[PDB]
Scaffold this motif. Structure first.
Motif, PDB file in Angstrom:
ATOM      1  N   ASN A   1      43.028  30.535  32.525  1.00  0.00           N
ATOM      2  CA  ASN A   1      42.076  30.655  33.591  1.00  0.00           C
ATOM      3  C   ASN A   1      40.784  29.979  33.175  1.00  0.00           C
ATOM      4  OD1 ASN A   1      43.537  33.639  33.727  1.00  0.00           O
ATOM      5  ND2 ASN A   1      43.674  32.374  35.562  1.00  0.00           N
ATOM      6  N   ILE A   2      40.905  29.043  32.275  1.00  0.00           N
ATOM      7  CA  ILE A   2      39.742  28.255  31.860  1.00  0.00           C
ATOM      8  C   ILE A   2      40.215  26.778  31.903  1.00  0.00           C
ATOM      9  CG2 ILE A   2      38.048  27.651  30.021  1.00  0.00           C
ATOM     10  CD1 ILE A   2      38.109  30.308  28.942  1.00  0.00           C
ATOM     11  N   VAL A   3      39.446  25.946  32.600  1.00  0.00           N
ATOM     12  CA  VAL A   3      39.707  24.489  32.644  1.00  0.00           C
ATOM     13  C   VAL A   3      40.030  23.983  31.209  1.00  0.00           C
ATOM     14  CG1 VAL A   3      38.570  22.236  33.085  1.00  0.00           C
ATOM     15  CG2 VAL A   3      38.476  24.105  34.891  1.00  0.00           C
ATOM     16  N   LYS A   4      41.253  23.527  31.026  1.00  0.00           N
ATOM     17  CA  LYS A   4      41.700  22.900  29.758  1.00  0.00           C
ATOM     18  C   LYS A   4      41.138  21.460  29.550  1.00  0.00           C
ATOM     19  CE  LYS A   4      44.110  22.906  25.880  1.00  0.00           C
ATOM     20  NZ  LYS A   4      43.070  21.918  25.394  1.00  0.00           N
TER      21      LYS A   4
ATOM     22  N   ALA B   1      28.825  31.518  40.915  1.00  0.00           N
ATOM     23  CA  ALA B   1      29.901  31.234  41.874  1.00  0.00           C
ATOM     24  C   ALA B   1      30.525  29.852  41.713  1.00  0.00           C
ATOM     25  CB  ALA B   1      29.471  31.555  43.341  1.00  0.00           C
ATOM     26  N   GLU B   2      29.693  28.840  41.432  1.00  0.00           N
ATOM     27  CA  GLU B   2      30.072  27.446  41.225  1.00  0.00           C
ATOM     28  C   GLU B   2      30.972  27.240  40.027  1.00  0.00           C
ATOM     29  OE1 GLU B   2      26.459  28.264  41.757  1.00  0.00           O
ATOM     30  OE2 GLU B   2      27.215  27.999  43.787  1.00  0.00           O
ATOM     31  N   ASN B   3      30.878  28.109  39.029  1.00  0.00           N
ATOM     32  CA  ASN B   3      31.711  28.047  37.851  1.00  0.00           C
ATOM     33  C   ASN B   3      33.155  28.505  38.065  1.00  0.00           C
ATOM     34  OD1 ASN B   3      28.799  28.839  36.276  1.00  0.00           O
ATOM     35  ND2 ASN B   3      30.126  27.257  35.418  1.00  0.00           N
TER      36      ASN B   3
ATOM     37  N   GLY C   1      39.286  24.152  44.985  1.00  0.00           N
ATOM     38  CA  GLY C   1      37.874  24.337  45.322  1.00  0.00           C
ATOM     39  C   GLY C   1      37.198  25.487  44.566  1.00  0.00           C
ATOM     40  N   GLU C   2      36.011  25.927  45.043  1.00  0.00           N
ATOM     41  CA  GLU C   2      35.237  26.967  44.389  1.00  0.00           C
ATOM     42  C   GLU C   2      35.507  28.262  45.076  1.00  0.00           C
ATOM     43  OE1 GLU C   2      31.078  25.542  44.645  1.00  0.00           O
ATOM     44  OE2 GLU C   2      31.502  24.172  42.936  1.00  0.00           O
TER      45      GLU C   2
ATOM     46  N   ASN D   1      44.901  30.608  41.414  1.00  0.00           N
ATOM     47  CA  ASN D   1      44.450  31.155  40.123  1.00  0.00           C
ATOM     48  C   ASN D   1      43.036  30.700  39.794  1.00  0.00           C
ATOM     49  OD1 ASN D   1      46.971  32.460  39.489  1.00  0.00           O
ATOM     50  ND2 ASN D   1      47.777  30.326  39.181  1.00  0.00           N
ATOM     51  N   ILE D   2      42.232  31.591  39.225  1.00  0.00           N
ATOM     52  CA  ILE D   2      40.899  31.269  38.740  1.00  0.00           C
ATOM     53  C   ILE D   2      40.965  30.208  37.634  1.00  0.00           C
ATOM     54  CG2 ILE D   2      38.982  32.235  37.342  1.00  0.00           C
ATOM     55  CD1 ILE D   2      38.893  32.881  40.325  1.00  0.00           C
ATOM     56  N   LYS D   3      40.098  29.205  37.675  1.00  0.00           N
ATOM     57  CA  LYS D   3      39.814  28.340  36.502  1.00  0.00           C
ATOM     58  C   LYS D   3      38.319  28.329  36.299  1.00  0.00           C
ATOM     59  CE  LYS D   3      43.915  27.178  36.082  1.00  0.00           C
ATOM     60  NZ  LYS D   3      44.841  26.790  34.918  1.00  0.00           N
ATOM     61  N   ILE D   4      37.843  28.943  35.247  1.00  0.00           N
ATOM     62  CA  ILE D   4      36.432  28.831  34.929  1.00  0.00           C
ATOM     63  C   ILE D   4      36.122  27.380  34.429  1.00  0.00           C
ATOM     64  CG2 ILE D   4      34.472  29.824  33.588  1.00  0.00           C
ATOM     65  CD1 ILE D   4      36.071  32.464  33.879  1.00  0.00           C
ATOM     66  N   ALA D   5      35.149  26.715  35.071  1.00  0.00           N
ATOM     67  CA  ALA D   5      34.727  25.383  34.631  1.00  0.00           C
ATOM     68  C   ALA D   5      33.326  25.345  34.005  1.00  0.00           C
ATOM     69  CB  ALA D   5      34.818  24.374  35.807  1.00  0.00           C
ATOM     70  N   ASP D   6      32.995  24.277  33.277  1.00  0.00           N
ATOM     71  CA  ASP D   6      31.561  23.992  32.970  1.00  0.00           C
ATOM     72  C   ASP D   6      30.857  24.934  31.978  1.00  0.00           C
ATOM     73  OD1 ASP D   6      31.443  21.716  34.740  1.00  0.00           O
ATOM     74  OD2 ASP D   6      30.824  22.989  36.463  1.00  0.00           O
TER      75      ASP D   6
END
Length: 300
Positions: free
Chosen positions: A64-67, A131-133, A88-89, A141-146
């Motif tokens: 759930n985290i951008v690889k 929210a943007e993250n 999207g977000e 599925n959630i992907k946390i980015a940034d």
């Protein structure tokens, strides 16, 4: 256009530091996002932040985290090749759909708390969660980015206190839960002075439709005194977190063991002209070079 092994397909984001392109990895046919950063335009603390983020992205391996797949470095330009989150977000998804029902909020928030708790296990504090993250993949599925900020700021920001530990992330997660289940912010204002008074009082409106379980969970995040906020590992045991999950209590994520010698991907790669030794060296060394990227991308 070509960089490394990537056919750039279309711009998906353009700021002042970076452009983000959707690309295809030529060797695998795999779709990736490529962040292209002109380093010559960045000041010193922006360079600091970029090098820290690269260091963090290399270390995080959570579903759930951008690889990250590849880092390509030239003198002038840095390219970060990473997982494309095509859904999207969460932010846009709330504005578009309304509040999430608690059952859906819980499915996403279990993923969010798992990802953030996993960062904390590794002594990484996000510090800017909002929210943007929170992106979505194709399966939502959630992907946390940034690695819209004031509404998420912990009270210690306006007290002039230290703004350092994982407890800052714990406060922001309470704000995210609140926004998921209600589609609005718990602490808002027409300006910053207004926002600050609300954050510092710590009181929020309970929407009429909210469950007591969910309100009891917010109270474990939204604690004014930093040293009194619980760890995410403790909060994973909360009743709301686990409604519908009696068989699998949320627990700290354990990443699988390294598999660096997969004979299927290695055979394909020797064919491409890579040596077994450089495949091993790159992976063990977590080099994020082309050889490592190709191995990771063959894993889809």
């Amino acid at each position: 256009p070509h960089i490394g092994n990537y056919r750039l397909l279309k711009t998906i984001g353009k700021g002042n530091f970076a452009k983000v392109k959707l690309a295809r990895h030529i060797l695998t046919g795999k779709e990736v996002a490529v962040k292209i950063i002109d380093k010559t335009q960045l000041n010193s603390s922006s360079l600091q932040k970029l090098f820290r983020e690269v260091r963090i992205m290399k270390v995080l391996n959570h579903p759930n985290i951008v690889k990250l797949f590849e880092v390509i470095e030239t003198e002038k330009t840095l390219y970060l090749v990473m997982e494309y989150a095509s859904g999207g977000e969460v932010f846009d998804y709330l504005v578009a759909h309304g509040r999430m029902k608690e059952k859906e909020a819980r499915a996403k928030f279990r993923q969010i708390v798992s990802a953030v708790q996993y960062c904390h296990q590794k002594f990484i504090v996000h510090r800017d969660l909002k929210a943007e993250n929170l992106l979505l993949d194709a399966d939502m599925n959630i992907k946390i980015a940034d690695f819209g900020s004031p509404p998420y700021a912990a009270p210690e920001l306006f007290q002039g206190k230290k703004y350092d530990g994982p407890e800052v992330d714990v406060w922001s997660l309470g704000v995210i839960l609140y926004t998921l289940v209600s589609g609005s912010l718990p602490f808002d204002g027409q300006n910053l002075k207004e926002l600050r008074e609300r954050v510092l009082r710590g009181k929020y409106r309970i929407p009429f439709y909210m469950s007591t379980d969910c309100e009891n969970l917010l109270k474990k995040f939204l604690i004014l005194n930093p040293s009194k906020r619980g760890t995410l590992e403790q909060i994973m045991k909360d009743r709301w977190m686990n409604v519908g999950h009696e068989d699998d209590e949320l627990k700290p994520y354990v990443a699988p063991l390294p598999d660096y010698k997969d004979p299927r991907r290695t055979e394909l790669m020797v064919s491409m002209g890579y040596t077994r030794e450089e495949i091993q060296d790159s992976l063990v060394g977590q080099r994020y070079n082309e050889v490592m990227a190709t191995y990771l991308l063959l894993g889809y």
